[PDB]
Design a protein around this ligand. Sequence first.
Ligand SMILES: Nc1nc2c(ncn2[C@@H]2O[C@H](CO)[C@@H](O)[C@H]2OP(=O)(O)O)c(=O)[nH]1
Length: 104
Amino acid sequence: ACDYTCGSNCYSSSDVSTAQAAGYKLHEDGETVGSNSYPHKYNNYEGFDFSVSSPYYEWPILSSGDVYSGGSPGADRVVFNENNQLAGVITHAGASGNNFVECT
Ligand SMILES: Nc1nc2c(ncn2[C@@H]2O[C@H](CO)[C@@H](O)[C@H]2OP(=O)(O)O)c(=O)[nH]1
């Protein structure tokens, strides 16, 4: 059930998988949505120890279960690479400024 905990939001592997597929599809087509143009490159300023190689891209994952479509992105993000491999699930929740912390 609670595979990933982002602040108080609980995500299953299915939730992450569904969000990742949607974000990768848009990346593949070269399209973006929302005021911050997702999905966009994630430079890894936080220095997370990802097991998959870059480049990384961040895409919002919504607590409601809906697939992000341009509205309010919220605090949570799924990070995937060019091979459509999951790098990690991160969040602004519990972090300072525009920084991210990993979901556990
Ligand atoms: N915090 C953070 N921001 C990143 C990173 N990669 C790209 N960004 C973008 O760098 C700027 C400063 O944080 C923002 O535009 C942010 O996009 P988001 O705000 O959409 O995440 C990253 O690794 N960490």
